Design a protein around this ligand. Sequence first.
Ligand code: Y0O
Ligand code: MG
Lengths: 301, 300
Amino acid sequence: SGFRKMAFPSGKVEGCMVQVTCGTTTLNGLWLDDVVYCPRHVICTSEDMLNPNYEDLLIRKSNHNFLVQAGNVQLRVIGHSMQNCVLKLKVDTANPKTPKYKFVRIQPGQTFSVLACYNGSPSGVYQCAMRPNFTIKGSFLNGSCGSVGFNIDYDCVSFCYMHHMELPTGVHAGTDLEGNFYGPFVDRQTAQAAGTDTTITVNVLAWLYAAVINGDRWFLNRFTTTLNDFNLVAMKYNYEPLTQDHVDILGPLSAQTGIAVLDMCASLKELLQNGMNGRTILGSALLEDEFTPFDVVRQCS
Amino acid sequence: SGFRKMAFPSGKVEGCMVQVTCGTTTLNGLWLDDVVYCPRHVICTSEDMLNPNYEDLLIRKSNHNFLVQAGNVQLRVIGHSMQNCVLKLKVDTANPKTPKYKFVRIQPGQTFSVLACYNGSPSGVYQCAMRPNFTIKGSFLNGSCGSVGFNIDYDCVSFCYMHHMELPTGVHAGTDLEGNFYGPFVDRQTAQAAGTDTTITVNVLAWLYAAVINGDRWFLNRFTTTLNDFNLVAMKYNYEPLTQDHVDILGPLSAQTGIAVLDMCASLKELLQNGMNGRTILGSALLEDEFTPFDVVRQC
Ligand SMILES: O=C(O)c1cncc(C#CCC2CCCCC2)c1
Ligand SMILES: [Mg+2]
């Protein structure tokens, strides 16, 4: 029993973190076969960050301006190029610990594990969700840029995030491994803000099922509702709309517990309208929305 | 910024996870150098659960009754011995992936990472604290026994926990890697219930300091308290007594924020009396007690 925010084992990704230095800027890179991936803003100075011309700043640079350190070894850069907001440094040596991997882009609401690193050195792992506003509530300090997010599906690591920047409200923004930003952000020092966030409704429902599986039942009631009726309640409380696709995904938990999704939505309706009345659910006073249905099934079964 | 329950990177421990089988029972073992450590109840059958006589069960075993599997490879057992509640199996290959490591017995309130495993394959990593009642609030399914808890200092892994069983309230009990149980528990199916749990006060204080560091001050007040008056109040909310040791431990975080320890204690007293009136602290609507003073310094 028990339910914890759980990250994937990080060993396969630990074997790929390197330190990348360009001038004064030092940050983290991802070393897979003979290429090191890192944020292109590693080439920027303080003057450059205000309005960088990346194609221009790069063409003036050359291989030897990139110091790549894998643990105690120096890797020598034999080539460099850009893909979107990611810098790709071809190196002389393939990483012998390259795991089976894919680059995937995740959808808001989906979860992944983050290996936080400093100076190419992994320091911690935690689980988070891509928010509806495309930010992540991470925990990062200076030098975390180029830390990566990932899922593991079957010895295969699916790399989905690379950290680029912190926003003024303390949350974080980054790209997929092809350099495409999540959300309407740019890698430049300008005024950027997270949009108003919303709650991931399908994930809250999943977590309620987790709580039922773990013996927490007080919020269940005799009522059901409809998709239309509930989605009016969701809109009112800044929850994402619940779609039919969401209901189908939850299908397994609805079977395995005997509470149907609209049955469970009725509980969530009630929790939203009346609160928790001093009680908790899985040790939380808040409705938790960073567990997917899949997260719940994998951890609970 | 931000503040996350953050675990240690698990790779160094993943390279030591193996599967141990005896009879029909399979669970996880920890492979370090030429020794595999696992819970000794791997040698129990159904009939043995209530009053196992481990010495009698073990003396009937030979090396080749223990199957150890590291990934695809069978390891050959060449010796075995029991130390307290762990079995130590000597194997014919030293683990090439053995990290720098030590065994440490931790005190209640200390935190660590757990690498949950099934069949010697790691499933997930999360962060735990040793509760004051010597249990841990884990996430473990059948087959996770022998999963381990650890901290990593620089590159040395300090193993501090091995999972043995789930108590009836859904919390978990285990040993250090010398096989001594944390708490009053035994590897026996008997009525044993965890002590009433309490909140780890020194950790709550450390996390309140964390909140100040990340720029949040709404919960402070203009009062202070004596240590004894604070403890008289906090034990009415089932908080652990705060000792002078704890006051000393918090000294550094006090200096970094400019808030004396007993002033933060006064703030905690008021939080317990008032709740948070719809506010949150570092994103939580409860007082968080699974971050230690040391954890806060490391993550902030
Ligand atoms: O792990 C298994 O599958 C398994 C299978 N048969 C017997 C046992 C046992 C035992 C003695 C104590 C161990 C700790 C709490 C329960 C009782 C365990
Ligand atoms: Mg209902």
